[PDB]
Symmetry: D2
Subunit: 213 residues, 4 copies
């Protein structure tokens, strides 16, 4: 559908010493995958795409705690397009909280939702996500919005991992399709760390162990 | 310190001196605070924040009404400062969502309040975009303090100079401004001015055009 | 004509502890006059104005060694407007070198110019300046360009000091009209220092003495 | 280290993946380096520069052909790093202006060459946007070194991977790129693409449309 910028399994990303990384993360990473400014540029084209489709009207839906960073930037770029409209265009920002927990037994997925979503009826709703792996967060967000009978529904995600997709709702706007590696930085922390890391990088084993839980 | 004081005297800035979207040509009076000025002040606030709360964990709690632009920017500057620390400092970011009612701002209605007990024994920075009568905050302080945090500080982009004020003063003030109704940057008006970068006084023809 | 943003003699600028200033300049300044981002926003409106007038065509003329900073930013904003034109618009950047020396005796002003200005004939030329005080740099740049018979001539200056103007060519685009104080930062260094200072501030006596010559 | 190597293999990026001005829809083949990637790399180069030349004075010498965007950006990052130093480090910024002639790039024609003897006994960083055959630089190095600087390093945004290359290698490389003719960011084409943020390979219909 437009797989986004494809970062392939074959020799992925960039060597660490090529970009600016906080010294206190010198050992906590393997490679860098997507430098910040690269995220920005892509996110910019992405906002252009969104307006192509959406815009009757638009309710941008942010997924809380985690997804604020990418939402912020994506919306900054959109606000940027809107400044030139001949009529001022109302956009409404909306929020769901959503947390996940390790399943442990069974397989069974654990999702804890959101609250107050009256502002959804008959509107054009964009779901904004940080990353897609198993597809459950997306699937969860999907049926949740269909529940409030909107007009239109699209999913934007900065990241889509190249993994065993169960079958679902293929995202409409994809920032980057990346290898099956565990990534931190930009929008993805690891137990409260890496927030000051602007780039999407692969966490190392030293990092995982050091940044406990 | 009451932050950058913008006087009752000569208000702010003439509209044509800065870049504003054509669709708002009519909906404003003055520019109080251009976007970049907000950024520069915010960069400083972030620095003040680390001086008093740095090293320790800190839970950044955003008072989420209609947007979190300010929160977003404050945290980028804070993250920018934390890039230098010898040790990586973990930062917990959370939101407390308020819905609006009633004239009677002191009555808060929290919606997004997951484990409020995560706050217990932690260092909380509460981030707010504008303080007016001061009622919302002071009754929000009451709620928060019951979960006995180790310490609570408050940071507001804008503190309005009003008689209607009950005297609550934030620990970090971006700008002390005149008692006029402002929009822009982080303050929307019935879903409008979201794309306006600057803090500007809303005109009467804008007040009518966009009113709920 | 449009005096620009007026910073008046009466209680000018902001207290130092209100903005972010390099620690190594803690004592070398009195007040801050124009924070960086404020310069940016104004510069932005300024680029809009320029396009109003100019644009047949445009030759933006940069004054070398000193004026590169403001030129860079002003042109970045203009490039930004140009991206939306339906036809790609050629802009030509041009350069003069220009140095001044303390007069000492007489009064007599010393100006050392520039070289190769063939690309001036019949074009629309913008003179870009950092600051206007006595008006001589502007006057010098003026008669120099009139010498190559252009079509149109305008002066943009970020700063205009409120001082004894001798009489000349009043600038077309003014960023800020500021008090008669000695200012450093942003585009104005002091013997190689203050380049890392983004804001326009008033140099103190400690600063003057410390930053020798 | 040869900088960020962009392979002959899979070139760069599909045009529709990034934001490019509508008037160039037709005048390009691929995006090699999006603007923000340039910025991020440049931020690192600035850091590498300070590691080897920091503390000392350093004269930043920009090789000025048609523009100095890159120079401008490199110096902002350098100034950004210098904001932290205990002592203020004075930085001398100068330009050396070259005009173009003749196929024979090694023959330089300096125009803007005020006191070239200011370089004597100083630490010079020479900043260039693209290196191709390497002739311009190596004969520019000859000129500069005669004023006996204490030390000369060279920094180039782009080093082109060409057989036509005489083997000169800069001390700091932004990106090693394929042997294709690129425009954008800092490289204009007969006054065009100045407003193009990214490094992109120029198409043949763009080569014709804008040719001198
Ligand atoms: O690579 C990852 N870094 C950080 N968190 C990750 C990563 N991969 C998966 N996660 C968990 C959070 O996102 C899960 C997306 P879902 O599996 O589609 O619901
Ligand atoms: O000037 C205003 N612009 C936008 N919203 C405003 C303004 N003044 C008051 N409000 C509503 C939200 O501020 C109320 C917080 P409180 O009055 O301190 O409880
Ligand atoms: O306030 C100043 N800071 C730094 N340099 C300054 C200042 N005022 C004057 N100068 C000298 C450089 O500009 C001179 C402009 P002119 O006197 O109009 O030719
Ligand atoms: O790919 C190019 N884009 C724009 N200008 C280019 C390109 N390749 C060569 N030039 C001309 C300037 O570069 C020549 C420097 P030299 O060939 O190392 O002496």
């Amino acid at each position: 559908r437009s797989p986004g910028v494809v970062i392939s399994d074959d020799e992925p990303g960039y060597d660490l010493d090529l970009f600016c990384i906080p010294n206190h993360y010198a050992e906590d990473l393997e490679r860098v995958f997507i430098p910040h400014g690269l995220i920005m540029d892509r996110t910019e084209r992405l906002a252009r795409d969104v307006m192509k489709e959406m815009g009757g009207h638009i309710v941008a839906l942010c997924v809380l705690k985690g997804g604020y960073k990418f939402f912020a930037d994506l919306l900054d770029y959109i606000k940027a397009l809107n400044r030139n409209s001949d009529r001022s265009i109302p956009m409404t920002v909306d929020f769901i909280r959503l947390k996940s927990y390790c399943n442990d037994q069974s397989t069974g997925d654990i999702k804890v939702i959101g609250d107050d979503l009256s502002t959804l009826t008959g509107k054009n709703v964009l779901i904004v996500e940080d990353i897609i792996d198993t597809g459950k967060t997306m699937q969860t967000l999907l049926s949740l919005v269909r529940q409030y009978n909107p007009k239109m529904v699209k999913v934007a995600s900065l990241l889509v991992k190249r993994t065993p997709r169960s079958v679902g709702y293929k995202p409409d706007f994809v920032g980057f399709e990346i290898p099956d590696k565990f990534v931190v930085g930009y929008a993805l922390d690891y137990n409260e760390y890496f927030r000051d890391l602007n780039h999407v990088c692969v966490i190392s084993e030293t990092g995982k162990a050091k940044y406990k839980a």
